[PDB]
Structure formats: structure tokens, C-alpha cells
Design a protein around this nucleic acid. Sequence first.
DNA 1: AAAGATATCTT
DNA 2: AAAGATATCTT
Lengths: 228, 230
Amino acid sequence: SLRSDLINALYDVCGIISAEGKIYPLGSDTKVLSTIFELFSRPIINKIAEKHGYIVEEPKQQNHYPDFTLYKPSEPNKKIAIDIKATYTNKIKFTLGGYTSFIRNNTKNIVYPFDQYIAHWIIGYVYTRSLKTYNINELNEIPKPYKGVKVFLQDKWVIAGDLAGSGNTTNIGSIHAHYKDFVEGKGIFDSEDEFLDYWRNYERTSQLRNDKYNNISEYRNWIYRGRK
Amino acid sequence: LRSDLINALYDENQKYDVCGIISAEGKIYPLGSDTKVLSTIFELFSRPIINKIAEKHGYIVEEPQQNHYPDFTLYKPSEPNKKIAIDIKATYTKIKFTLGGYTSFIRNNTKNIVYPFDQYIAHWIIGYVYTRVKTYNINELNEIPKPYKGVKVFLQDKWVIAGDLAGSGNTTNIGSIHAHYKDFVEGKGIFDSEDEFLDYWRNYERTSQLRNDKYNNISEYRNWIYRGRK
DNA sequence: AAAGATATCTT
DNA sequence: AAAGATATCTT
Ligand SMILES: [Ca+2]
Ligand SMILES: [Ca+2]
């Protein structure tokens, strides 16, 4: 299938190269990598989609989820969203998007209405942590600022957690497990419906959550009480 | 340092473009449409120059560790106490920049800054201004499609191009003047001094409400000051 | 944790 | 505007 091939396809940057052949090495910022990984998945996401007859689309306008929207023109409401993410192993975790945007307002901050996607994949890259230029002839001497990239493709609701991944930028956090857990799909939600209900009703600050729920158990008890 | 720094950036930029990332196996990947990527790609490009010019003048240059301003710190070991902060920025085409938070180091000397705020005597913004616009190989490189066009660069003191409105809400950022690239190079800002910059941003409220009674702009700040900050 | 930094875009 | 999205990271 589209999913199996993609996973199959997905299984080392030297730096930015300028049109004059000079190569600037990467820096220590963890920022540079997340984007680097998108650039690396791009060709693959595309060759596989095409092979399967999907069209790929990236956001045109800013502040929009997801990195890649795959779909057939024939099946407009069976859209697939793919989001590239990465973090360094130091048990790993991810921020998985806002809980106050599109999941609460179907058309807020998403390239296509949320009800139009029937899958939300996360391709996660996991990795391990000279100020001069080089030429192609000396690629072998350029310092890599990370090693052991490992990746997995996995449905989002599956690895989603019950703790927010950020504060002022209200992000859903993922489970705080081992790479094998994301791959294997060991999560905490019974279903996607639960995943969504939990995050659609999550409050922003603890102060508002203490009177409602702050974890999956408390939420389930919250349902029992009558969502009151 | 300053004059040398810009001459270098001006010349190299008017003669060099980034085409994409390159792998350990020679495979070149074209850049993306992500605006946010460019702000870092220009940083990488700038590192060699900065290090080089700084080296001529006897400055040691340092980068931080996660969530710490600034991108580059320059100081002479014989004069550690006089640091130069350099923050790379970038944006597309009037232009506006977000110039960092107004609740970290400007209010608390050591919060989210590589060295105490009071150890720096200059904070320079090197701004990159551009216009928005397969797996390649070196011998193809010249014809790889870029996502920007007409990159310009200025080097200016931060307090100079700093504005009197927030550059962000939830993340409490200082916003620059919303002006043309020329006003940035010439320094046609709104603050009279650096202290008027510091004071204004240190007493600025996070919400319109709180400001409603205090001051929401440079004129109001100045009237506020006249009365004795009342 | 849980809140708020880092940084940039947007109505 | 001003406030709240896109992200990821650390206190
Ligand atoms: Ca930096
Ligand atoms: Ca910067």
C-alpha cells in the first residue's frame, strides 16, 4: 500500500552548498535539522505518492499544518496528512501540533479542512547529538553534527500523549517512551476518538485542568462523572 | 570590526546563492518553501565571514546552547567585559522583524542569554531581506531552483531599528519598525537612545488592557515620562 | 510538570 | 494592532 511502500522507502547531510561549490557546515542549533529532514523526505514522499497516484501539496500560506497533504482528486475526503518531526535521543518525546487550532475549528490553520483527512501520519526522525567552507573534493572532512538517524512512520493518535508538549504555544505532547514504542505503537488512547475528545477538551493551564482532568485516567473518570 | 563586517557581507551576498543541502554521498537536495528555514540558512552562510573578520580584529567568537540569545558573541579576551552580540535575522518583502523577547535578559540580566546582558556593549542585527519565489548533483548545481530572489543585507544596532509595538503576542517579542530596507540601513528608527529603548521595553505591558492605562506607543511613553511615569 | 523561553508569521 | 498560530526546547 501507500503506507507500506513509504515505510519501506524511508529504510547524512554535510551542509548547505552555494552555487560556487563552497560548502558551509551545519551548526549546533537543533532547529536546522527538523527542516533538513523535511528536505530529505520530500523526494521519497513524492516518488511513492506518484507511484500510488496521489498528488502531494505543501502549505503555500504560513502557519499551516501539515507538511505534506497527499490525496487523489477522485477521493477528496480521503486526504492523508504527513508531518515531519525530529528530536534528539538523550526515551524520546515530540510536540505534535496545537490542540486549540484545527481539531477545535475544522478550518483553522490547516491547508484543507480537518474533516477531509482520514489519516494523520507522523514521520519521526530520531538522531544522536568547522566554521569554514569546504569544496566537494573534501566532503569527507566536513563535521556532521549528529549521528544515528532512525525514523519511523506512525499514526498520530497512536503516539499521542496526555501531557501538553508546550505551554504558551499550546501543543499536544507525544508519549514519553522509547523509539520502539513509537514504532510498535504503544500508546495510551483506546482509539482516535478518545485521542481527539481528550485534546478537544483539554484546558490550557493546570489551574483550569485541576477542576477537570490532567491525565488520561482523570479524563476517563471525567467521562464517568458525566463530563461535568 | 563593524565597517569591515558589512563590506564582507555586502560583497559576498551580491555574488553568492545557496542552492540546497548536500549529503555525504554528493546528493544535493533543493531548499524548501519554509520561510523559517532561510533565517538559519543565512546564519550558516554568515558564520565563515563573521569568524574571519572577527579574527582579523582579535575577537574570539562564540555561539550559544539551546534557547539562548545571541547567535554570535564577540569579545577580546583582554577585554571580556566589552561584548558584541550579533543576531542574524531574515524576512521577506515594507519589512518587519521580531527582535527577541522583552521579558528575558532585558529584564533579567542572565535569563536566556549566553553572558550577562550587562557584559555586552553592542547588540547588532544582521538582517537578510529576500523576495519569495528532485535530488541534484554538483554538475547540475548551477541550475538548481532557489526559493528566494534578490537578497539584501544590512548590519544595524538593535535599539536603532527596534519599534514600539509587539512583534508577537504569546511569545512577547519586541517588533522592529515596519519600514523599507533603506530605513534599516540608514537607521531611521523611533528611539532617541539605547536607554530610551531599554526603559520603554522594560515597562511595556503584555496586554492592551494593562497598557491602556500605561502607554501603548512612543508618544504615550514620552508623555508618561513627563508626568513622572504616572 | 508546567510555564515560558528561543523565533517568525497573520489576520 | 494585538493575540494567537507554526515549532521545539528547558526550567
Ligand atoms: Ca544561531
Ligand atoms: Ca537569529
